[PDB]
Design a protein around this nucleic acid. Sequence first.
RNA 1: GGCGACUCUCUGGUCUGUAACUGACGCUGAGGAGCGAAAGCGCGCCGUAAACGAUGAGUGCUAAGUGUUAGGGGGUUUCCGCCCCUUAGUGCUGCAGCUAACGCAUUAAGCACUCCGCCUGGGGAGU
RNA 2: AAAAAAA
Lengths: 708, 149, 64, 101
Amino acid sequence: KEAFMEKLLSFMKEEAYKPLTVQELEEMLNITEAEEFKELVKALVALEEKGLIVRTRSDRYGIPEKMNLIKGKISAHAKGFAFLLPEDTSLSDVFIPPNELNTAMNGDIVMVRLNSQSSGSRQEGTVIRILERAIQRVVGTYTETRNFGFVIPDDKKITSDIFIPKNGKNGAAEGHKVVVKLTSYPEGRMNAEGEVETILGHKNDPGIDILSVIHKHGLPGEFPADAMEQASSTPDTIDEKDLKDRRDLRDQVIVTIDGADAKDLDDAVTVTKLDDGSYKLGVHIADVSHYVTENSPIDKEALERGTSVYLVDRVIPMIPHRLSNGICSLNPKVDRLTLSCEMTINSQGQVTEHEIFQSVIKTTERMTYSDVNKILVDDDEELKQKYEPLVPMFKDMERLAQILRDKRMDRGAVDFDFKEAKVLVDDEGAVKDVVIRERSVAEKLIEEFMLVANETVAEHFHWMNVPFIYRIHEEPNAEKLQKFLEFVTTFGYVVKGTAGNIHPRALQSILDAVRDRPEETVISTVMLRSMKQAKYDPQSLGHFGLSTEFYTHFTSPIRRYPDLIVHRLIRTYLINGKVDEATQEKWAERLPDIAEHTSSMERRAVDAERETDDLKKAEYMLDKIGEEFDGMISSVTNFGMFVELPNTIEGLVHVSFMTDDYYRFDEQHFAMIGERTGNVFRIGDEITVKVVDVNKDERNIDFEIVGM
Amino acid sequence: KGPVAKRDVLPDPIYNSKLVSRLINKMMIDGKKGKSQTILYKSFDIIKERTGNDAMEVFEQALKNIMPVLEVKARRVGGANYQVPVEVRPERRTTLGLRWLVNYARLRGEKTMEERLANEILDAANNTGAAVKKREDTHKMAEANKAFA
Amino acid sequence: KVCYFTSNGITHIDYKDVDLLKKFVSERGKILPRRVTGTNAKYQRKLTAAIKRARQMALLPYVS
Amino acid sequence: NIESGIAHIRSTFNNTIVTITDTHGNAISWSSAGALGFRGSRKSTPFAAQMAAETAAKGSIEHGLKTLEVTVKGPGSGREAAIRALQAAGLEVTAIRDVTP
RNA sequence: GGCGACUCUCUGGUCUGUAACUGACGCUGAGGAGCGAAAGCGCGCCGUAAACGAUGAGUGCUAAGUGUUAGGGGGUUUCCGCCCCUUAGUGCUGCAGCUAACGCAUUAAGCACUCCGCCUGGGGAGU
RNA sequence: AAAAAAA
């Protein structure tokens, strides 16, 4: 028994050892007999009792001592506790009590000692060391006292007020939202101290709410002077020299189909039906790599920006408004430089042939999604008569897009069709309405055309075997998916597969079965929560969500830096023919940092857009205090249950408002069960709620139950 | 209901250390702060004459080694009898530091208290003696029943 | 939330049309309530029988 | 040497047993949370049930099973993790069946 | 009293619509006859039982507003669809009235008429 | 809360 325990501990003490499960230890030790398997489990329990190994709450055994610890990121909570998110995503989260944070703030990379005993369901730990400080600046509301100021942070995860000394005020008055720079971190009993870097304005002034979010996240402000000089010097028309070595497509019937308010027209499309029955699809994308050249002032800024950010009241663009909306934009009935992908597609949606090349186009008409739907779906005779030459092309586009959609779903792609909000604001930035964003035929048509363009480019460059950027979506976390599978089994939905080896078509085989059910929204939602996020990467690792091996972003260079690089690598490798070793090694070095950076800037963006939506959703419900709404239980917890209205506004029913009974949370069933009444409020249940309170600053909406 | 503020002691006039004052007040008997102010200033001259280091370098080192990190607290919920490992608040660390320092210094074999207090500080500073042991003892005991908390 | 049968003009629910029925049972095979289906009480009664005749003839399961 | 079999999973509040049988209900192999040295609260957990399904499954794969019918008994939390231990061990699951008496 | 697996054989009743027919053929009903928790016991006897909405039966009449079950009709509506109107229940809320109060309030405990059962202090004693 | 995608 002891010789085996030593041999396990020595194996785990090897420098190449990573934390492994019982099964991954069984495989690595080549244990095939059932009696040796019993020995291993008995050794693991005995070593874990002695404290020589630690099981993480993802059931992975690691030598603590090489750590006694886990390296990871702090994810703080507004109630003063936190979790460690380990770097190894296979490991579970470690709970950190408020007293054991030891001055670690939200986002800080820390080393956490593991507590041999736990007071709850999860593994506890103490922050022993802070390796990296995440928070240097803090946005908050300044408050004035007699002799000093303090700033109340907008990030509620910062649970302590920032002390502003009398010299660090820098003109900030009572109620001003302010950007503080942290001069000292919290230490012992002392709060953080800081100096007011920037006054944003008063908290009640219009647009300061969104301007506090921009600064919180650290989103990019005004363009640099050299970038705006480059933009102002860029020609408003094409030079005749730039038409050289480009295919002339100005005589073809080419259209843009966008939102009515869209000015940054990235894509233009055509479809011709061939005599054999196959479709030729042209996709013509704005040639931004021409205007924005490598290491230009705009190039350095766009990389820094990483993506365009689309907040409620404004867009922060990646490139200046003179280019994005002017010369890059595929504006109607004017000559525009493009980088095209031209595709012959057969009757099963297979790209038999393709070509990628530089062209010039002149768009026949700028269409809207609304107009294209009214022609196809609503059968509008007035608009058909208006666009009589284009209607036959639109009908061929509809059929082709359906073809491509069928193949996509047959290959086992996951159609995640959720209701998103669109917040509608006025000129002052005050909320008028919160509507559901509906995806029409016209949006699903262009989607399919950008997708088949995006796979086609990605496949082309994979086989060329040159350095390139892909848009990958890795396989879901097996533990998160294992929980999701357990969740849907309560509703009856049994899935064919295991959490380690699920096929994308298996998850769709859920989303179809729940379609037009009450439990749709939440199973949909919890499925998402088990998926990984998509990122950019120089390796073609495939896209799980689209069920494809080859995918990149090619179709939006105005508003995405990874697309603008895809444009450059197209110009470098195909057009210029520069496939030399020195060119490849140059890109092979750069693409990892770019791919990591732009992926960070995307996540930052998405977080910021959401925060502004949740703020304006809360603003919208201020005047609805006392009104009753139908809704659907979107989440249940130990403290209460969240209720989603039809417009996708969410709120909390706190358990204190559930006055009719003592309610116990059932974690397995995701249900609040009354002890006496036997009333059961489950995930997915339709209830009628009333608005009790609304906090705009916190973004909180507080309901009470009227009826089931 | 709201944590009473601890009395703000003055700094020790010659070492400018409110820790050293707190030691005096711990050593003081029957309100004879004079006797204890003398004893310490006699004990710290003994430390400086032996070691050559400043008494403050040694005394702070002595406290580090006496000061407890985790303590046993009795919890009897239903049955339990759980000796809950409790982290010693930074004020209670110094408390138990100075309490043990003084309590064991008085128990030592040496004739005078100034020598007894000096030798307990010198032993504490070398990570040895009885007051350091006492911290270990409760930690050994806190490690023994660490299964609770 | 409309009734399938008042919508789709379906007077007679037949026990042999398994695939239809299979629109209203759970995955365990239990009969879905009227609330959840949006069915008319009339037809729910109709349906229910159909199912119980379907389950008797091993067209549907009792317990999945 | 038999291919098709049933995996009778008895998940109680105290324990999770996993017998695997032939179609005639003759026991090929079995494993329980108690058999893998789990004790007290640990025997109840879905981890022990998963682990009990594997050692049961790996015992059956020796006798040369491929397909499993599954029958679950009892109110325990093990059935979902144990079943996904039988699909993860390699044996395909034809049909589950709650046979709680 | 009661009545929930499915099928079939056989049989009672209920409601909606039309009014072709019949032409007041009705209503209540002491007695009798039958049914009848639970038993009791020995398939019969048993025959009583919060066998109590704690409310005989029948009919006409007297603010609403809302839900549901099974029907009828109209509106546009192809059709669903709502909307309107009605009938038979089954529910809630609530006038006028009624109540000792509580409540009941077109499923009256309101206003009327017919017929039957039943009460006249508590205990003794359902002895 | 948590996803693609689109913008």
